[PDB]
Design a protein around this ligand. Structure first.
Ligand SMILES: [Cl-]
Lengths: 25, 65
């Protein structure tokens, strides 16, 4: 499935994961 | 580059229709880097993630989740 593949391909949005953690402390 | 700019670059590389799904997968993945996160904190992480496409100027500009 397309969206899962794009997520994996774009580094699992690793920088967005960092953003989301940054504002969730 | 700074983290937010890297985030908007990765997100931009995701197709518009896939950005909200992908952001949901990012919220899930971010939980793994933390372990025990309460339901209120999980809901907040989705709230933060929901704002990212507007911050980035990326359609669609909000994710319902
Ligand atoms: Cl766009």
């Amino acid at each position: 499935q397309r969206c899962r593949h794009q997520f994996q391909t774009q580094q699992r949005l690793r920088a967005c994961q960092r953003v989301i953690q940054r504002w969730s402390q | 580059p700074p983290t937010l700019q890297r985030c908007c670059r990765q997100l931009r590389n995701v197709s518009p229709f896939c950005r909200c799904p992908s952001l949901r997968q990012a919220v899930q993945s971010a939980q793994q880097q933390q372990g025990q996160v309460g339901p209120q904190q999980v809901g907040h992480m989705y709230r933060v993630a929901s704002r990212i496409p507007a911050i980035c100027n990326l359609q669609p500009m909000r994710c319902p989740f």
